Design a protein around this ligand. Structure first.
Ligand code: 2LQ
Ligand code: 2LQ
Lengths: 310, 310
């Protein structure tokens, strides 16, 4: 793999590939991603941080926004409490192996120049357009607030105000990214990561839906969560156990199982694992056993770094 | 009339009368009103400035916001052009006899504290509530912008940020004023003036609908506008000529007409004029003749002050 293929690996879409090839030529190039401070950091965050590490290995200067005002507008609580949670997320991100520039959005979202462009962008953004970009982001509210439509123009304005070359995020951010590419004079290259399925197979993995694996979960907690996880035999779509093996596990992958069930099975790639699973040649119980133990080894250095603080 | 009755004269509603009686007791008390800069100042503006003069005579410190950012959000053009029009409106307001503190909204709408409370108010204002408050204010747009819902929270935030005791405006501002009384810790006393009917009787008098009488219109232009004005005999509702006589003319009012049509008619009050008009005892042509000539005498000092600048 070259540097472009390393960045494209395990992404849902790149907007666009030709524009990304331009950015890779530059000596200096920045990539940014924002997270609303979350009480628990799960594999969804780890997947995005792993992609930010790929960009860092490719010569990108990484910037991480601890989006305190975004979480405040999205009804996550008060600013002072949101900020201390964001400081906890920074420690977890650094424990993941990401050395970057962690900044709070409120450090620039109150500048007069930034605020003035918020009003300019509001003139160019329709209410229907702004609401459509927040369908997969806005916190559930039977009575949507004006803050829901201010949210997307704040994220577009930050991209313009700070001038990153590449913006990274889940597929739920694509409509906001499509709006930034239409309204801003400099088009930002967008890298969109897949949205992990919840452990119960119903919806996406969310910190507020209790269907996630936290990066600092104990080994016994990981084994129990995977044991109860949705993993129908032969079904790869919507299977969170297969997603974990595709996006986090390293290959070759040695699957250990008793001799009475076929003996240990070595798989050199995820495409080989998917083939063994579609035609029921690998049982979900054996898949869950290997995925749980390998994921525990993956997250052990992260949980250890966090346990050392106590 | 006492000071309360002087303020209540020719107003549509006061929210509330008991709260206004509290404010009148204070030595210091401020009243504010905002205008989006308009290329032409008509009787609708004069009606509100006359009410601000009443408050000034009652001991109020008057503040006038040349709402440049409001007009910018409401699609009135660019900021630099909007500001020079606002400076022209200040000259017209001063020519009307109002000596007050004329301030541009952008002088405080970019402060970090003001902007921060805009986001707080956005958390408490629903999109349906904000859109309902802008139905009679927002510029016609088949594709409403996010700026339409930012507009009402900017006006509510200014009331809180600058701390006026009384807010004045037309009846179209009542929903925004109702929102400010719900969300702000200090409830502002709201004085709402009637909305003048257009000269054609279709809709309200607007600077963009060409159904207005400008305060600096020439006498011949005033006579022609009134001659073509909607003024059905016996109909008082929606009659702009009767509105002008009620809100601008002084009484007793001597109506001059030929002897062959009843001779000159002296009316001591508008209620007497309305009685003579409902039962066709005063012809619309004679009403238009007297209203035009008296309105010309009313606006002569204003047009003269403006003509002297040339
Ligand atoms: N909307 C997202 C949250 C989010 C996503 C992105 C942003 N921030 C950004 O887009 C930043 C990122 C770091 C770079 C800063 C310079 C400019 C852009 C803020 C919040 C979600 O739903 O998780
Ligand atoms: N929405 C109105 C325009 C408008 C109305 C009011 C305001 N401003 C105000 O409410 C100001 C007025 C002067 C006092 C300033 C201190 C605080 C309040 C700004 C714009 C319309 O449609 O004409």
């Amino acid at each position: 793999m070259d540097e472009f293929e390393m960045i494209k690996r395990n992404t849902s879409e790149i907007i666009s590939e030709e524009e990304l090839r331009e950015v890779l030529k530059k000596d200096e190039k920045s990539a940014g991603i924002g997270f609303e401070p979350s009480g628990k950091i799960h594999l969804g965050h780890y997947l995005q941080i792993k992609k930010m590490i790929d960009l860092q290995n490719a010569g990108f200067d990484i910037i991480i926004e601890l989006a305190d005002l975004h979480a405040y507008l999205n009804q996550k609580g008060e600013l002072d409490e949101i900020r201390k949670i964001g400081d906890y997320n920074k420690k977890v991100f650094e424990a993941m192996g990401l050395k970057a520039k962690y900044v709070y959005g409120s450090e620039w979202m109150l500048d007069k120049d930034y605020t003035l462009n918020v009003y300019r962008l509001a003139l160019k953004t329709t209410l229907k357009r702004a609401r459509r970009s927040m369908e997969l982001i806005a916190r559930e509210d039977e009575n949507p607030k004006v803050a829901e439509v201010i949210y997307p123009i704040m994220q577009v304005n930050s991209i313009h105000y700070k001038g990153v070359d590449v913006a990274v995020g889940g597929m739920e951010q694509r409509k906001i990214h499509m709006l930034a590419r239409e309204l801003l004079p400099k088009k930002v290259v967008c890298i969109h990561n897949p949205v992990l399925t919840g452990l119960d197979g119903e919806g996406k993995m969310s910190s507020s839906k209790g269907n996630f694996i936290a990066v600092d979960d104990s080994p016994e907690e990981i084994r129990a969560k995977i044991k109860k996880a949705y993993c129908p035999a032969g079904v790869v779509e919507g299977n969170p156990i297969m997603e974990i093996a595709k996006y986090f596990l390293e290959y070759p992958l040695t699957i250990k199982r008793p001799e009475k069930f076929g003996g240990d099975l070595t798989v050199n790639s995820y495409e080989e694992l998917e083939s063994l699973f579609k035609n029921k040649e690998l049982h979900p119980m054996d898949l869950k056993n290997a995925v749980a133990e390998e994921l525990i080894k993956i997250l052990e250095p992260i949980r250890k770094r966090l346990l050392e603080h106590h």
